[PDB]
Amino acid sequence: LGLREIRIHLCQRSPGSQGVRDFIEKRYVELKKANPDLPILIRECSDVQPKLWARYAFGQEKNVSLNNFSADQVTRTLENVLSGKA
Amino acid sequence: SNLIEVFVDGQSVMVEPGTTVLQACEKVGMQIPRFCYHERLSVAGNCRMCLVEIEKAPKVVAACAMPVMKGWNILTNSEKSKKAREGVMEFLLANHPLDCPICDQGGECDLQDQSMMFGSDRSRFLEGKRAVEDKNIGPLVKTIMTRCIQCTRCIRFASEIAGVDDLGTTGRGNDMQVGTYIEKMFMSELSGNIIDICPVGALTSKPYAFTARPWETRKTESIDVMDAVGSNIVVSTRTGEVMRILPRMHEDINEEWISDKTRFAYDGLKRQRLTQPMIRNEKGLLTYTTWEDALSRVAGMLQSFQGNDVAAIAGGLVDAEALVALKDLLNRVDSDSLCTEEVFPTAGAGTDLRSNYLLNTTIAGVEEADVILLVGTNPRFEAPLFNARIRKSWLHNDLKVALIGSPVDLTYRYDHLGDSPKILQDIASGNHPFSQILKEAKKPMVVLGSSALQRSDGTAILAAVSNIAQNIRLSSGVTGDWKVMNILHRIASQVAALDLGYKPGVEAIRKNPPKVLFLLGADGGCITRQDLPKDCFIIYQGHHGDVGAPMADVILPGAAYTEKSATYVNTEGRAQQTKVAVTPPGLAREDWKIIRALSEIAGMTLPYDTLDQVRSRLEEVSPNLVRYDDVEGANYFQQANELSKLVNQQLLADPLVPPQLTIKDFYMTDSISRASQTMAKCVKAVTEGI
Amino acid sequence: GVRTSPTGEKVTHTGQAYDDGDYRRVRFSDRQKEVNENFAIDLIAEQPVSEVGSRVISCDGGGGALGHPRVYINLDKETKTGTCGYCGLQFRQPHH
Amino acid sequence: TRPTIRPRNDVVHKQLSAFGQYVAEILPKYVQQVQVSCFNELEIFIHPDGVIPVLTFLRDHTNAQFKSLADLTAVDVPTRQNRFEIVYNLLSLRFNSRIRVKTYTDELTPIESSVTVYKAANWYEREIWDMFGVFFANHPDLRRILTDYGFEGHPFRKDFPLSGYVELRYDDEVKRVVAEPVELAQEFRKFDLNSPWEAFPAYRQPPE
Amino acid sequence: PTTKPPTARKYIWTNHKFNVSGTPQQYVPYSTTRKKIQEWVPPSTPYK
Amino acid sequence: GTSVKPIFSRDMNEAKRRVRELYRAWYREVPNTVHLFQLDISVKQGRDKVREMFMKNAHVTDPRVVDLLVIKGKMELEETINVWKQRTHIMRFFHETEAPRPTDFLSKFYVGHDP
Amino acid sequence: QLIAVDEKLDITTLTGVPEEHIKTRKVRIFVPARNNMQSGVNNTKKWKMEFDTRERWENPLMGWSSTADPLSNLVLTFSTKEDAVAFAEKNGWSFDVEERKVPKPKSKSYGANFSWNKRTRVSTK
Amino acid sequence: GAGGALFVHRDTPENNPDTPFDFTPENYKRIEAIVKNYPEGHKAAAVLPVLDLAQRQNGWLPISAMNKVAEILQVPPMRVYEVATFYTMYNRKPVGKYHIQVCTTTPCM
Ligand code: SF4
Ligand code: SF4
Ligand code: FES
Ligand SMILES: [Mg+2]
Ligand SMILES: [Zn+2]
């Protein structure tokens, strides 16, 4: 339940990360305003695939793929991770 | 095109105008003999070893200074060129001393090799040789001037690369000597490189003297961890012992040079070393122990507490693998108090966006900027190769430099604006004269030292600097991928720790003091036992006995940067990996292996058993830690700038003073250099020249 | 110039001597430790300094072709003698 | 140029070039290259399928009569796709001449045995198999010749370590000689002797 | 050596010795070099 | 066709049949080896050693490699049958003197640096 | 006739190397860096393949340097990087490859030593 | 024959950095006039006359005179040392009141 940190691994120029890129450049700041104490690490992926990591208490973490998503899709999955809804 | 056609031994080559005969010859794999020419120094033309014949020209020309003409045919192996080489080598060897067995340049001499490949085999010199008295220029460079051939490489290096004009020639004719003419110490943070550029044994390394020969050494290519520049180096070992450190050429990081701390602090790896595990006995004294019992003690103490009661502080020479292993181990206990001694502000973006704490322009990009503003730093001692790059751009590209802070000597003239931080705000405001200067510039750069961020108002300083950069970007527009904003780090372990998610600074531990403290090579003295609850279990894991070890309950001996294959991230974000040159002494072990063994003992076994698996974990946490020469990254300056505006912390009316104010403060910064006996000599020589 | 270790072991000219707690001394039980008695540093220190009337002197170690490669020593410093890099013999100009 | 330089012999050079042209003309199917060195040695590079024909020709043709097989051996060059190079040195007593035939193979491609052409090859091929692991097809008795019984690996390969992998000692618990992983009181000290300056400009390679 | 005596040197043995193998005077090899790595010495005073 | 020629076998089936022939020969030879060399092991122990040696190369999929392995095994059997080998050579297959190297992480960490 | 093997080349079972020195070894494929003490570049033409450094200790007698891994001195030379990679793959060794570092072309001008207005004018020769 | 003199400086009570030397005000006017001869931004070109001027005021060239010239013309002291040791008209050791030079080259020989 207790979220500790989240990581967005997005690849810089691959088309599959394009929507994710849009998120980072449109509505990441607002999100950082809403969660001023939650680590949200933005990291650069290789030529393979974009994905999101979520870490919970006692080191348990899970990842979801973000390939060919849109800005709406990525904010939807991010808010699903943030809330107690899957 | 603009290329012109020349011929090397009748082979057509297309070269840009201004190319010399030497560069045209090396464009087809032909290396002209040389003694005085260095591709990173100004042309001298005095040694005359490079004389080559041009077809249909009676006079041989100096290939190192002669631009190629259209239609020229260079004859690198004709009778005239060979005879010129033989005559020049004969003159060079006429007065040279018969010192090869006692010379440290023995198997590494350009004079020897070019005599064997281009000179004659006999001597017809039937006179007495000349002898020159030696000069003392300090404890680092040993001088035997009889072996000097007067190529003036050291003089040009000092004058141009180092910005120190202490070396020269006195006299004329045969009795012309290279020196200072006075008893003067040649102190420079890059003074050791004159040992490497000198083709002969006239300048040699004093700590290295008489210990090894070049053919015995095994060469291990590795990365320097003494600063955040990450200079590429070669550790030369012999029979499992480190003999010396040499520069390894990297055109984008350190070029051909290293720092004096990089070169001469390796002996500190033999002085105060942790070799066996230690625990406290019934009398409260540290005593030797097997690995099993110390690991069991630490695991038993770790199993008792959980959450906020367990904290860890990382030191300045900690690798990425050890950092991620400790992060995982403390996460299994549900702890997040993973901190670094170096402080970086966490307001706004903090460490969330990488570009917030990187040198985004990169080191090679310095040679493209037309103006640079330095805030609250001494780049000469914090990052000597970065300062060398700045000096190189100042010399060749006519770079304009300004500094806000203490008026330190940077070896090049700069416009000093003062040391009051308020000036930063004035520049952002536009009231200041310098603000216009940044506006007219096509490629401005602003560099903020991480040492200025260590003070109380570091967040305010970072906010003001970001305001200045944003004003530049808004006024001049986006020039492209220029990345005006930069941060200059001084800790080799800081950037990797920030990438992995470590909390910068120690304030998290001071807010909630822990019951169990992990000191992963933390020898800065930020946290003592006065700032901790009594009966605190302190665990120190490192390779040196320094200020952090005697205050621990359990000591776990770790490996040094020369004893492991470890990943360190640059101040510009470039990940690099060292290689094992020698194994750790005694019972010392690799750090990530120590953490994994401790995890298995304590019951929360980590999912990695080998180095490849722990680097896979590193990729899982931060993918940039496995790209081992990549330096490209994203520009998220807009988001960080927006998030830095929500905090309006007041600046301090305290002048910016860097921790390193003179050369004496440069030599001892970390545990290795404090344990080094050569740096003690350097400090003593700087304090009293005698 | 042999000296005695606190444990009673002879110290070689290289300065080596096993500590009290070192088990490797057991190899010398019922046998002896081989130490050369003539110390080259002390022997070369006894040689008198040669006075010459020239700024530059030549040294070949004596014996002509039976010595070392011939080298030339500068003697312009008045506060220190010139030392051969092979033989250790010292040379100086008349001072005082 | 007289005293210290080895003198040249152009007559032998011309004769060897003429005979190399002759051999290349007669056997176009297998001959890939012919060379004559500066010290008058004739070399013929052939396809691996021509070992039996070419040698037979060189032994039985009236103009060749290379009746003696002086030496047969292999050379290991790891950078090549065909790792191993098979060299045959032949001597002709009738014409007082020496010739060299070279072919190539890798670790998995067998080479046809030349025992029928030359009896002397029988041991040499065995030695090659022992030292490099090159298999010879249709060999009357192909087995190890130089190494110890049960020796694993081929020592003359470049990737084989100098001291090998195992060492022998007598053990009194089992009362016999045993093999154990190799351990050295003094490790062999590798020396870096190559000069960083070019020695022979005539052999310089294009810089790509 | 009675008619052509050898040269006198101060370091030449004045007393010849035969092969001393198998006697208590036999040569025993050892490493003549000093210790390479020096270990950290913990303080003698208690920390708490 | 990858331009590769066989040694003996053209597909995996012929290589497998040659493997089975060699295995049969070794299985038949084991008791004679035990008797002649005067080994202190059982026939079952030697046959299990033969099975282990055959299974050590069970992952091979190249018929040429299987062919070369069968050829080497034939030479080994010919060495054993003709008493060219000695008791020492035969008993090297068992490593009676070698101390077993531990495989778990903790023991490797305690003893040294090797992975 | 040809049999058309379409498998990956693997000669691991034929080389007789102990399995310890095949699976746990890591090789480095690289062009060696120039010795910074000399300007000659003849030792930076070919590719080298070497093995990871293992433990060396001191002999209890005479203090020599003892080793326990047979691949301590094994260095192989290749003309191209692809040949080294192919050799490593077919021998079953895991490898790490470093790209060649070539010095950038420099712009040298002797006359620049005597500039009328630029910063490159020297103060001594 | 040989040079005889030495091209290194060793400190001495009669020759050291603390040895008192300074230009007379009229010599300062002369230095100003000398410096005015060369283009702006090239002030090292005046080391040859100014240094000579010092030798005219003092009779020889102590290390303090070289340091003073370097400080006045804002050049590194090493460059002034190089100029002083290169040229034979400069006296880095005191000379007599009347300095007698005899030409001994072949036409005079
Ligand atoms: S510098 Fe070179 S040539 Fe001169 S003495 Fe030393 S090794 Fe010999
Ligand atoms: S000391 Fe070395 S680098 Fe300097 S001029 Fe003499 S030979 Fe050249
Ligand atoms: S290299 Fe051209 S003159 Fe020295
Ligand atoms: Mg040198
Ligand atoms: Zn001598």
Q: What is the DSSP string of A6-25?
A: EEEEEESS-GGGHHHHHHHH
Q: Across the strands, what pairs with D87?
A: D73, D102
Q: Chain F contact for G4, CB < 8 A?
A: yes
From edge to edge, which strands make up the β-sheet containing D68-76? D31-36, D42-46, D97-105, D84-92, D68-76
- Taking the CB of residue E32, how many other CB atoms lie within 10 A of it? 14
Q: Which two tokens stand for residue D105?
A: 């193979």
- Give residue D78's identity as a one-letter amino acid code: P
Burial-class residue G34 by CB neighbours within 10 Å (0-12, 13-18, 19+): buried
Per DSSP bridges, beta strands B537-542 and B554-557 are parallel
From edge to edge, which strands make up the β-sheet containing B242-247? B218-223, B232-237, B242-247
* Residue nearest atom 7 of ligand 2, based on CA coordinates: B148
User: What are the DSSP calls for chain G, one per residue?
Assistant: ------SPP--GGGS---THHHHS-EEEEEPPPPPTT----TTSSSEEEEE----EEE-TTTT-EEE--TTTT--EEESSHHHHHHHHHHHT-EEEE-----PPPP---SGGGG-SSSTT--S--
How many whole angstroms separate alpha carbon H64 and alpha carbon H78? Answer: 13
Q: Does B130 contact C85 at a Cβ distance shorter than 8 Å?
A: no
- Taking the CB of residue B311, how many other CB atoms lie within 10 A of it? 26
How many whole angstroms separate alpha carbon B277 and alpha carbon G77? Answer: 42
- Give phi and psi for B673, each to the nearest 5: -70, -25
Helix (H) or strand (E) holding B619: helix B611-621
In sequence order, which ranges of B421-558 are alpha helices (DSSP H)? 422-429, 433-440, 458-476, 494-500, 507-511
B51 Cα–ligand 3 center, Å: 7
How many whole angstroms separate alpha carbon B655 and alpha carbon B661? Answer: 13
How many whole angstroms separate alpha carbon D89 and alpha carbon D80? Answer: 22
How many whole angstroms separate alpha carbon B162 and alpha carbon B189? Answer: 8
Q: In this structure, are residues C75 and C92 in contact, taking their beta carbons and an 8 Å threshold? A: yes
Of B31, B34, B42, the CB nearest to G122: B42
Cβ neighbours of residue B111 closer than 8 Å, sequence gap 6 or more? B35, B92, B93, B96, B105, B149, B199, B200
How many whole angstroms separate alpha carbon B671 and alpha carbon B674? Answer: 5
How many whole angstroms separate alpha carbon B144 and alpha carbon B355? Answer: 49
Which residue reads 């077993």 in tokens?
A: F100
- Residue to test with chain D: of F2, F5, F66, F77, most D Cβ within 10 A: F5
Cβ neighbours of residue H34 closer than 8 Å, sequence gap 6 or more? H46, H49, H50, H53
Which residue reads 């001994």 in tokens?
A: H104
- Give residue G94's identity as a one-letter amino acid code: S
User: What are the DSSP calls for E7-37, one per residue?
Assistant: PP-TTS-SS-----TTSTT-------SPPS-
- Give phi and psi for F9, each to the nearest 5: -95, 145
- Taking the CB of residue F38, how many other CB atoms lie within 10 A of it? 7
How many whole angstroms separate alpha carbon A68 and alpha carbon A49? Answer: 9
Question: What distances in angstroms separate CA B183 from CA B138, B619, C73, H8, H10, one per listed residue?
Answer: 10, 55, 20, 9, 7
Question: Cα Rg for chain A, rounded, in angstroms?
Answer: 12
How many whole angstroms separate alpha carbon A42 and alpha carbon B354? Answer: 7
How many whole angstroms separate alpha carbon B144 and alpha carbon H36? Answer: 43
- Give phi and psi for B457, each to the nearest 5: -100, 35
CATH class of C40-92: mainly beta
Closest-CA distance of chain F to residue D62, Å = 34
User: What are the DSSP calls for B360-407, one per residue?
Assistant: TT-SGGGGG-SEEEEES--HHHH-HHHHHHHHHHHHHS--EEEEESS-
| N-terminal to C-terminal alpha carbon distance within chain G | 74
Q: Which two tokens stand for residue D164?
A: 């090998």
DSSP 8-state symbol, B214: T
Resolution reached, in Å? 2.6
Q: Is B36 assigned a ligand-binding role in the annotation?
A: yes
F63-81 and F12-37 helices, crossing angle to 10°: 20
DSSP 8-state symbol, B101: G
How many whole angstroms separate alpha carbon G115 and alpha carbon G111? Answer: 7
- Subunits in contact with chain D (3 or more CB pairs closer than 8 Å): B, F, G
Cβ neighbours of residue F82 closer than 8 Å, sequence gap 6 or more? none
- CB-CB neighbors (< 8 A) of B501 in chain A: 5, 39, 41
- CB-CB neighbors (< 8 A) of F41 in chain D: none
Of B613, B355, B319, B365, the residue nearest A44 (C-alpha): B355
Q: Is H108 assigned a ligand-binding role in the annotation?
A: yes
CATH of the domain at G69: 3.30.160.190
- Taking the CB of residue D38, how many other CB atoms lie within 10 A of it? 9
- Give the number of domains in chain G: 1
Question: What distances in angstroms separate CA B31 from CA A33, B75, B118, D68, G97, one per listed residue?
Answer: 61, 13, 12, 47, 27
- Give phi and psi for G56, each to the nearest 5: -120, 135
Q: Does D178 contact F89 at a Cβ distance shorter than 8 Å?
A: no
Q: Which two tokens stand for residue B531?
A: 């700032």
C64 Cα–ligand 5 center, Å: 11
CATH class of H25-86: mainly alpha
Which residue reads 């008209």 in tokens?
A: H89
User: What are the DSSP calls for A27-46, one per residue?
Assistant: THHHHHHH-TTS-EEEEEE-
* Residue nearest atom 2 of ligand 2, based on CA coordinates: B198
From edge to edge, which strands make up the β-sheet containing B371-375? B415-418, B400-404, B371-375, B444-449, B485-488
Q: Which two tokens stand for residue B398?
A: 């006519």
Q: In this structure, are residues B544 and B523 in contact, taking their beta carbons and an 8 Å threshold? A: yes
Which residue reads 């290519």 in tokens?
A: B221
The torsion defined by the Cα of B182, B183, B185 and B186, in degrees rounded to 10, comes to 40
B99 Cα–ligand 4 center, Å: 14
What sign does the dihedral B129-B135-B139-B140 (CA atoms) show?
negative
Greatest Cα-to-Cα distance within chain E, rounded to the nearest angstrom: 82
How many whole angstroms separate alpha carbon D66 and alpha carbon D101? Answer: 12
Asked whether residue G6 is assigned to any structural domain, the reply reads: no
Q: Does G56 contact B221 at a Cβ distance shorter than 8 Å?
A: no
Q: Which two tokens stand for residue D61?
A: 């043709």
Asked whether residue G11 is assigned to any structural domain, the reply reads: no
Of A35, A47, A51, the residue nearest A3 (C-alpha): A35
- Taking the CB of residue A68, how many other CB atoms lie within 10 A of it? 13
Instruction: Please tell me the number of Cα atoms within 13 Å of B575 on its side-chain side.
Output: 23
Q: Across the strands, what pairs with A11?
A: A45
Of H79, H81, H86, the CB nearest to B172: H86
How many whole angstroms separate alpha carbon D162 and alpha carbon G39? Answer: 32
DSSP 8-state symbol, C85: T
Asked whether residue G13 is assigned to any structural domain, the reply reads: no
Q: Across the strands, what pairs with B339?
A: B313, B503
Q: Which two tokens stand for residue D33?
A: 């290259």
Question: What distances in angstroms separate CA F52 from CA B354, F28, F99, one per listed residue?
Answer: 54, 16, 19
- Cα angle, residue B58 at apex, residues B53 and B62 outer, rounded to 5°: 40
Of B250, G17, F109, B148, the residue nearest C74 (C-alpha): B148
Q: Which two tokens stand for residue B216?
A: 């015995």
Buried b (16+ CB within 10 A) or exposed e, H1-20: eeeeebbbbeeeeebeeebe
Given its phi and psi angles, is residue B148 left (phi above 0), alpha (psi -120 to 50 degrees) or beta?
beta
How many whole angstroms separate alpha carbon B677 and alpha carbon B635? Answer: 44
Q: Strand, helix or coil at A76? A: helix
- Taking the CB of residue D28, how many other CB atoms lie within 10 A of it? 7
- Give the residue numbers spanning the domain of G107: 19-113
Question: What distances in angstroms separate CA C18 from CA B239, C30, D81, H23, one per listed residue?
Answer: 21, 17, 56, 68
Chain centroid, CA G9 distance in Å = 23
Per DSSP bridges, beta strands B516-520 and B310-314 are parallel
Per DSSP bridges, beta strands G94-97 and B177-179 are unpaired
Closest-CA distance of chain F to residue B385, Å = 35
Three-state SS string over B540-579 comes to EEECECCCCCCCCCEEEEECCCCCCCCEEECCCCCEEECC
Q: Strand, helix or coil at A78? A: helix
Helix (H) or strand (E) holding B197: helix B193-197
How many whole angstroms separate alpha carbon H65 and alpha carbon H68? Answer: 5
- Give phi and psi for B475, each to the nearest 5: -75, -60
Three-state SS string over B22-62 comes to HHHHHCCCCCCCCCCCCCCCCCCCCCCCCEEEECCCCCCEE
Closest-CA distance of chain F to residue G41, Å = 36
How many whole angstroms separate alpha carbon B632 and alpha carbon B635? Answer: 10
Question: What distances in angstroms separate CA E29 from CA B654, C24, E22, one per listed residue?
Answer: 67, 11, 15
Burial-class residue B524 by CB neighbours within 10 Å (0-12, 13-18, 19+): buried
Residue in chain B nearest C73 by alpha carbon: B131
Residues with CB under 6 A from ligand 3: B 34-37, 45-50, 62, 64
Buried b (16+ CB within 10 A) or exposed e, D137-162: eebeebebeeeebbbebbebbebbbe
- Give residue B489's identity as a one-letter amino acid code: H
The torsion defined by the Cα of F52, F58, F64 and F67, in degrees rounded to 10, comes to 30
Q: Is B200 assigned a ligand-binding role in the annotation?
A: yes
DSSP 8-state symbol, B20: B
- Residue to test with chain F: of G1, G12, G13, most F Cβ within 10 A: G13
B203 Cα–ligand 4 center, Å: 5
DSSP 8-state symbol, B486: E
Of B434, B375, B441, the residue nearest B408 (C-alpha): B375
Asked whether residue G37 is assigned to any structural domain, the reply reads: yes
Of D122, D189, D129, D183, the residue nearest D156 (C-alpha): D129
Q: In this structure, are residues B452 and B377 in contact, taking their beta carbons and an 8 Å threshold? A: yes
Of B491, B248, B466, B242, the residue nearest B375 (C-alpha): B466
How many whole angstroms separate alpha carbon B254 and alpha carbon B386? Answer: 8
- Give residue B441's identity as a one-letter amino acid code: A
Q: Does B590 contact F113 at a Cβ distance shorter than 8 Å?
A: yes
How many whole angstroms separate alpha carbon B332 and alpha carbon B509? Answer: 19
- Cα angle, residue B80 at apex, residues B75 and B82 outer, rounded to 5°: 85
Given its phi and psi angles, is residue B195 left (phi above 0), alpha (psi -120 to 50 degrees) or beta?
alpha
Of B422, B441, B443, B430, the residue nearest B471 (C-alpha): B430
Question: What distances in angstroms separate CA B261 from CA B267, B381, B679, D145, G80, one per listed residue?
Answer: 11, 10, 8, 58, 37
Q: Which two tokens stand for residue G59?
A: 């002999």
Cβ neighbours of residue B677 closer than 8 Å, sequence gap 6 or more? B267, B268, B271
Question: What distances in angstroms separate CA H52 from CA D114, H8, H30, H31, H70, one per listed residue?
Answer: 93, 20, 12, 11, 13
For chain D, list the strands marked E by DSSP.
31-36, 42-46, 68-76, 84-92, 97-105, 111-112, 136-137, 166-171, 176-181
- Subunits in contact with chain A (3 or more CB pairs closer than 8 Å): B
User: Which contacts (CB < 8 Å, 24+ apart) does range H24-27 have?
Assistant: H24/H57, H27/H53, H27/H57
Q: Which two tokens stand for residue B469?
A: 């950069």
C52 Cα–ligand 2 center, Å: 30
| Cβ–ligand 1 contact at B256 (below 6 Å) | no
Q: Which atom of ligand 1 is nearest to the CA of B199?
A: 1
| Cβ–ligand 2 contact at B154 (below 6 Å) | yes
Chain centroid, CA B418 distance in Å = 28
